[PDB]
Amino acid sequence: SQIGLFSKICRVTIKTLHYYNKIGLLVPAYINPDNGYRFYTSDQLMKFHQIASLRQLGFTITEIVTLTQDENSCHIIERRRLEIQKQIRDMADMLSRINHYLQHKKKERIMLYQAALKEIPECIVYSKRFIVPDFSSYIKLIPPIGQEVMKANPGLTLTTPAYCFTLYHDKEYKEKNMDVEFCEAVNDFGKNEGNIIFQVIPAITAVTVIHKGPYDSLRNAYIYLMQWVEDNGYLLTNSPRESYIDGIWNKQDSAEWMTEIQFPVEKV
DNA sequence: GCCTTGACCCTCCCCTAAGGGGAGGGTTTAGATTGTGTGCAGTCTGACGCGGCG
RNA sequence: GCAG
DNA sequence: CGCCGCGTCAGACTGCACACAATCTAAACCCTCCCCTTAGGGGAGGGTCAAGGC
Numbered sequence: 612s613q614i615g616l617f618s619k620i621c622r623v624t625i626k627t628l629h630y631y632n633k634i635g636l637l638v639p640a641y642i643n644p645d646n647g648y649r650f651y652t653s654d655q656l657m658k659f660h661q662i663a664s665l666r667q668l669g670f671t672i673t674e675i676v677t678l679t680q681d682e683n684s685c686h687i688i689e690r691r692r693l694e695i696q697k698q699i700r701d702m703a704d705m706l707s708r709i710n711h712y713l714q715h716k717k718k719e720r721i722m723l724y725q726a727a728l729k730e731i732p733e734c735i736v737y738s739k740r741f742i743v744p745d746f747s748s749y750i751k752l753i754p755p756i757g758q759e760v761m762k763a764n765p766g767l768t769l770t771t772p773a774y775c776f777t778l779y780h781d782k783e784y785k786e787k788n789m790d791v792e793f794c795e796a797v798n799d800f801g802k803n804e805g806n807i808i809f810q811v812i813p814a815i816t817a818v819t820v821i822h823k824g825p826y827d828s829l830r831n832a833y834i835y836l837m838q839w840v841e842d843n844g845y846l847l848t849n850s851p852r853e854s855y856i857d858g859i860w861n862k863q864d865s866a867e868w869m870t871e872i873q874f875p876v877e878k879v
Numbered sequence: 880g881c882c883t884t885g886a887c888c889c890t891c892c893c894c895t896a897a898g899g900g901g902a903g904g905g906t907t908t909a910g911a912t913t914g915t916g917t918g919c920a921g922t923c924t925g926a927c928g929c930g931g932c933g
Numbered sequence: 934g935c936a937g
Numbered sequence: 938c939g940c941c942g943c944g945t946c947a948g949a950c951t952g953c954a955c956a957c958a959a960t961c962t963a964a965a966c967c968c969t970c971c972c973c974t975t976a977g978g979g980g981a982g983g984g985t986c987a988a989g990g991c
């Protein structure tokens with residue numbers, strides 16, 4: 612059976628048979644030496660059937676070489692079983708994500724906020740946890756802390772890139788009784804004089820959305836994020852953070868400012 | 880100024896998986912056919928040299 | 934096709 | 938040795954403008970080699986940037 616007839620028997624292209632010969636997966640029975648023409652037999656169709664049966668299960672080519680040459684190799688198929696289970700979980704989450712994205716673009720003509728699930732590493736921060744009467748009053752008392760901590764810790768260099776955020780330790784919603792904890796990441800340990808202390812903040816996977824503009828609309832992102840958090844079945848494992856990209860330090864106009872709200876979540 | 884020095888950074892080349900697509904090369908084709916035809920140009924005269932040829 |  | 942046929946060799950110089958050539962046919966197989974597809978990784982080769990000491 613010449614390669615054309617055989618390629619139509621097994622119903623696959625010629626280049627596929629060329630490739631399977633090139634990698635040594637399916638070798639013709641008899642190659643004519645001067646022309647190089649490949650001729651197969653029935654016992655090449657018998658092997659191509661096994662090859663295609665394994666290849667419909669997603670096995671990579673080298674995995675098929677091993678599956679056909681090494682017997683009692685059930686650990687590689689089980690490994691592939693676990694990987695396929697992981698991709699099914701991931702694809703179902705993707706389904707929920709794309710349903711929510713389509714649900715939004717029909718709900719609003721503009722996508723104001725996209726939600727990204729990113730991993731944030733562990734940090735070394737100086738932290739002050741305290742009650743706040745008003746979030747507007749919360750903004751002013753931070754540069755005093757900036758003076759104070761650099762005073763008490765000489766030569767303490769903050770991490771680059773700068774990570775300056777807020778934990779919201781409140782389990783429900785209110786506007787004037789916010790129990791917050793301001794954390795900012797530095798390089799080394801330090802002195803703990805004052806309400807300012809040092810602590811290690813563990814690495815977390817968190818869904819974050821970046822809101823750009825003034826802070827009075829920031830709650831929007833939270834409602835959105837909360838929707839997201841409930842829609843895709845994620846569970847909020849820790850208190851929500853808010854990391855400051857743009858603000859009074861870089862830029863003077865308060866409408867081009869930008870913060871990023873981060874929800875610590877776990878997949879359940 | 881004269882140097883070093885570690886940290887960055889750019890471009891470019893090749894690599895990934897499983898083949899697709901094409902370029903550019905080979906090979907055989909088993910009824911039997913068996914001598915080129917342009918509706919060609921040919922149309923320029925005079926001098927000179929050389930060679931068959933009686 | 935033309936010019937001298 | 939003298940003559941006729943045949944072949945070869947020439948045929949003003951500058952300029953513009955215009956403008957070439959135009960018909961004329963195989964197909965079905967196979968092979969190798971090259972470049973391409975994702976979403977960036979890895980690394981050689983070669984600049985560049987603040988810092989510091991001489």
Ligand code: 118
Pocket residue numbers: 753754756757758773774775776795855858859860
């Ligand atoms: C110590 C404490 C706070 C700030 Sb900053 C800041 C943070 C990261 C990168 C750049 C600046 C600040 C504010 C105003 C003027 C100058 C600096 C800051 C304040 C509040 C919330 C988040 C960050 C700086 C040092």
Ligand SMILES: [Mg+2]
Pocket residue numbers: 934
């Ligand atoms: Mg003329």
